[PDB]
Amino acid sequence: YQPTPEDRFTFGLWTVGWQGRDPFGDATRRALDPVETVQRLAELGAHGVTFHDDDLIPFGSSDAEREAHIKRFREALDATGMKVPMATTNLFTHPVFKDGGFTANDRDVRRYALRKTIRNIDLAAELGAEVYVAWGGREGAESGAAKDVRAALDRMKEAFDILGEYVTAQGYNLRFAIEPKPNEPRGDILLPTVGHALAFIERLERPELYGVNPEVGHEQMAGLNFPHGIAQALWAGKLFHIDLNGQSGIKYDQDLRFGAGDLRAAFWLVDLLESAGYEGPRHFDFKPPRTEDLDGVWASAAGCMRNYLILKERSAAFRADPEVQEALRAARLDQLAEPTAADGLQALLADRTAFEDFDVDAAAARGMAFERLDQLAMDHLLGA
Amino acid sequence: YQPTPEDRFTFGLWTVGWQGRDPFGDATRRALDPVETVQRLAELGAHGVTFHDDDLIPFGSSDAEREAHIKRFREALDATGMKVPMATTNLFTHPVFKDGGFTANDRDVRRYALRKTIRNIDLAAELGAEVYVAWGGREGAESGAAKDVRAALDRMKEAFDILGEYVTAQGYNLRFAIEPKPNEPRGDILLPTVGHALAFIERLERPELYGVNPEVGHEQMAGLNFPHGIAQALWAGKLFHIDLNGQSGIKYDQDLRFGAGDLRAAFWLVDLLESAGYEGPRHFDFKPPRTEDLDGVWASAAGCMRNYLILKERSAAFRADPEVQEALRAARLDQLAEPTAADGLQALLADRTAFEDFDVDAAAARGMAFERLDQLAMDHLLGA
Amino acid sequence: YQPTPEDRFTFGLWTVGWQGRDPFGDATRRALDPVETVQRLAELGAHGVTFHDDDLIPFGSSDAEREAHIKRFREALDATGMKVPMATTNLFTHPVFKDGGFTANDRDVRRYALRKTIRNIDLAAELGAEVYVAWGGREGAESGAAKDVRAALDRMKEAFDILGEYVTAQGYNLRFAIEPKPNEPRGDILLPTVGHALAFIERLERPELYGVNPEVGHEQMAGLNFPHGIAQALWAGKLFHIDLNGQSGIKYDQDLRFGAGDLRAAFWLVDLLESAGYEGPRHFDFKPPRTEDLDGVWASAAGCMRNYLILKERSAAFRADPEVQEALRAARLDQLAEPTAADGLQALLADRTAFEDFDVDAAAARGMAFERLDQLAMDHLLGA
Amino acid sequence: YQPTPEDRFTFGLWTVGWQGRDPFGDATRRALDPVETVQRLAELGAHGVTFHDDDLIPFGSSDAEREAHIKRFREALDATGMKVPMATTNLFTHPVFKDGGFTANDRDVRRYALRKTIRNIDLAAELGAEVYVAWGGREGAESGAAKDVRAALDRMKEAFDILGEYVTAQGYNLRFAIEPKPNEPRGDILLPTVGHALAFIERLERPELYGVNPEVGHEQMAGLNFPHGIAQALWAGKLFHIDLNGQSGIKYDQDLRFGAGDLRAAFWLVDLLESAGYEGPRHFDFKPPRTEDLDGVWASAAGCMRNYLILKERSAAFRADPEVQEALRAARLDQLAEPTAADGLQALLADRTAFEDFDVDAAAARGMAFERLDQLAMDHLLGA
Ligand SMILES: [Mg+2]
Ligand SMILES: [Mg+2]
Ligand SMILES: [Mg+2]
Ligand SMILES: [Mg+2]
Ligand SMILES: [Mg+2]
């Protein structure tokens, strides 16, 4: 199960080099040279890596100092053949965004949040990115009267339109993707899930330039079905980038490697992702636990990629199994896929097969045969 | 704090006439004649009532029996003077809806789901209903391959589109509201939150006919901030209806009387509804606990309207207090409604005040003053 | 993976005989006679069955047909070879237990709660039962003032103290087990987790006759690690019985097939039970979903024993693998099993290897090797 | 509503001097002087303060700078009257405890965490502390095979036995209090709830010197009822200490100021604390957010004591209302205090008022009048 560059396996600069700075602890790991990150990930069969601004260039560094990091990072990508499918902007680490970036109560920092994320859009496009991600972790509140949510969404819509107007002006080959999260650090984060994010996009001035960037743990932090949420994002056709990791239950944002936590949800996710034809990157926004040294760093990195391919093979033979194909026909997934009343509204009203002469008891007495179907989905995951 | 018909308080027949039958118990109170319940809320001060079709006419009743129950029900509303603002259909009780109604795996049961809905939509217009609520409690799955999520949404859009074509072909002054729910009775219900519903509406053929009907307990079942959900629903102008009750955490849908559970979330909800000019019905989808009698089902019902009205007084006097206003201004609540960059994108880029000449240390050093503000909101809530 | 009577699998009568009644729908399947349930459970490979006070005999039946139901069941146990390891009381269902059984507010129900329970432990002794289970599904309240939970625990202690008195008086070889559950149908259930139950045991008059009966789903309704709670129960030596089912997320009690939901928690559980040599019954307290016919409830019942045995094979080969034991050496699982201060306290005070001359950074720079260890367990779980 | 030292209000050194450094951001506030915090707290009405060993005295400082940090602080407490009722050991921040303190997988660091706790014990007793808190927030793991919980509970059982032997050896009058937390920083924590801790204490060799220190937020982080959890500790008589904060829903440990979050659970807590006669310190383990400057952290701590005085005032007026006293008797809370069967087990058997002649129908038809009681509690709290 060793990965190939055509797997589109991307990471970030914040994934490893996390140092393990826990809310209740200090650092444990070494500050990873942004160059030496892209080494091992190329040596581990990955394709591409992502980054924030402050992850690549130090905060406050001037142009020719910033330019010195971009060139050192450019030679590393060209020597190892790695790409950069996505870039981001840091709007949470610095204490200036206590009340958010695009939705801050102060107007000064709101305009500073735009200039900071605009200078980065130029860097994102000049590195061959295919999507720009915006994570509004600081956009939230702890008390009620501290933020009018209608006014904050007025500013978030105004901010995204300003960005979309900028990319259309410069003609960059890019599209945005909002990464939702229900809470942390704020008591409640604005646009907390894929549904809240997808609805927000449909009001933006140029909706075709925006998508969603769901992450496994974030939606599982609200008790929601991630394979169901990805399906709604795919059904709307607004799935531009995906963060993969593991998470158990409703707790703090634990960024375990992909495969850990909800293993069944990881199975159905890779099943839906490959069956739908998603050809974007398989990004991993995970953190190796601070329990590890500089040798368990890449074991967690290679682990989430080695996992992804295992469930990919088992979910493929699950759909290719003829015995399961008949169990899906028993579950009547042959129906459900064909239209309900494609004969029209008037034809449905005149049809008594749907009302007067519809034997309600016979249809109700038919078992859906879901258990025998789900057990076959089980045995394919373990191997039997 | 006595409720009046001016407050537009409606309740519903299944609410205060609930069996008391939970998954581990039989019935405590007897069933109620729908007329008995109508006289009842009229004496307390309710303005309207809502109902499922099976709550007014019993399932499997012929024409003469379904047309003798409406007459006794019509005479009750003509006497008490109460109106029917909302109506819904029952597609979860009968064992023919184990797999669902609009997204059932069986092609024939989906049509009866629409034939039973159309018959009740046609009668809702007779009683002067102006919003028809749809709650898909059985639209979902408990295992992965048991339901194609993209195909299920393909049938729910088709379902919803043909009844929008019906109400327009009939000229009924009626729109639709979607009641979202994350789980229960199914393991994972499609369109779980109000955002997933709002994202689903703008893919329908005529999005102006359909809105969201949020309920307190449902959004709190996903760990979400309910007053944040309505603010986004009001932001899109799709708060066609609302259901008011209580919930104490991520548990089962208990549907206790409004005001109980998350008391602070009800204060912020009643503050947002009144301050936004919402004019729809304030309707309680609550179930009195099975431990009560027939004198306790209306001591709890009266507690629903009172808990609202005394919260309406504490929230009004809060935002009307002059001391909270500069306390609000100290939190820069006025600068949040101010447009970030109404000067244009070209003016924002040429303004180095928002970047190089921006002092991030001085902007980060300000105090926000949220806790002094939140304590004033705690004082008006408690009466101190 | 065919189960044998020596695996000692147990199935409740209500388990596969659940007609499918949730708070939103009617029944789906027929009523299973207690006789036919035994013969079908034994053809699949089970070892014994479980019954409630009202699952074997109907409520309010005369003592003539009471012995008939027993003798008619007493036809099917000897003629089959199945057993009855566990018996319990049905102190819910009936409206008499609106507020509870042993901790009701009315003494009317508290005394009847005990007379009904002792009436069944006489039957449990005749059937050779070894563990009598009590589940306080109705003990609690939805409001704060409705129950002085200090006086309530005084009544659970009062009721449980005399139950062990009747057992010690009749010379029965019978022990008790507490089934913890956090919520549903009550708002908050007394003794919500295993720990609260174990603590309640150490305050009763005879803590020797009382243990716990934890269910994998009841503890996961509070986000707790179920393999952790079973480990504490085994460390205290009080795991008299165990309930096996499935549940994914903090929601209503789903009672899914074993292995469904959190499969990782199911893997580390079978690994824990087989490591400590737990020789009790593998009792499955699950409910096949309402979507199944009668053929679906047995393929699901067989699936419970099916995936326990497959998890038993992977967990055994995991710890019996040579390269896994060497990873436990790198993870230092040796030292946690070694005594900390076996040399005494005064030697601990005179040892500077544990304070002054203890290298802080050289001990903090070591890697725990937890992730490479966990992927080794993941490759064994998936059979890679 | 201004508090006095008679109210025993204490605050943590880490509470108001939190600096704001969180998972997603750098520090916001300046580091406060320990001598300053006590001045500021005494002029607000507080009675005492707490401290970790690394909070009062920085890590790695000399023995000369040690008592320099201790003396000037001691001179501050006696010059203003503040005491130190509580103290605890820091066993989480330094990367040495990245696997844990008492139950670390390496023996050399297990003995180190003990030799650090006994030193702060010598100081805690010299300053006049009455309790000492041992919260093992780094006890646990994230993978299944990383921690053998049975052998880990042996190392914690061995740990507390040593420190309890040291207390009885030095002649100190000091008792321990375990502060339980479900999750964070580790995936799953050992002894996650109050019950898990209480059951762990009864196994310890000298259980008289050990109790619980429950946190309001820590218990509802698993959806548990905190007023239910305190009175089980009050039942066992092991509530040596308690922490006051706020939390809204199952998520990361917010620790808002007391009053915020579950306002109703905060009401029922001080109601039980006053009725049960709690004389321990009303300690606050809250953290004012990043948003506040220095003037807000004192207003937040001021409202901390303010919300306790408001709730205690309305809890006393609730249980002293003549109308509530009769409503509690209509709910038959008085019969909950009466013993179930004080006449003996034989009389329980021979009395058929509790069985054969018991009116099961008339007893179930009685209402508990819980809703009217809960409304009176609402009206008393909401000033009506
Ligand atoms: Mg994350
Ligand atoms: Mg509901
Ligand atoms: Mg259960
Ligand atoms: Mg059981
Ligand atoms: Mg805390």
PDB file of C-alpha atoms in Angstrom, chain A residues 19 32 34 47 157 281 285-286 321 329 359:
ATOM      1  CA  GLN A  19       5.763  21.268  18.379  1.00  0.00           C
ATOM      2  CA  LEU A  32      10.847  22.262  11.401  1.00  0.00           C
ATOM      3  CA  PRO A  34      10.003  24.837   6.006  1.00  0.00           C
ATOM      4  CA  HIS A  47       2.557  14.924  -3.855  1.00  0.00           C
ATOM      5  CA  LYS A 157     -20.120  38.520   2.787  1.00  0.00           C
ATOM      6  CA  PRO A 281      -6.052  16.743  -3.419  1.00  0.00           C
ATOM      7  CA  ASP A 285      -4.845  18.546   8.303  1.00  0.00           C
ATOM      8  CA  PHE A 286      -3.687  16.418  11.220  1.00  0.00           C
ATOM      9  CA  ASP A 321     -18.521  -7.898  -5.255  1.00  0.00           C
ATOM     10  CA  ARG A 329     -30.633  -4.703  -5.250  1.00  0.00           C
ATOM     11  CA  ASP A 359     -51.650  -1.529  -0.601  1.00  0.00           C
TER      12      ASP A 359
END
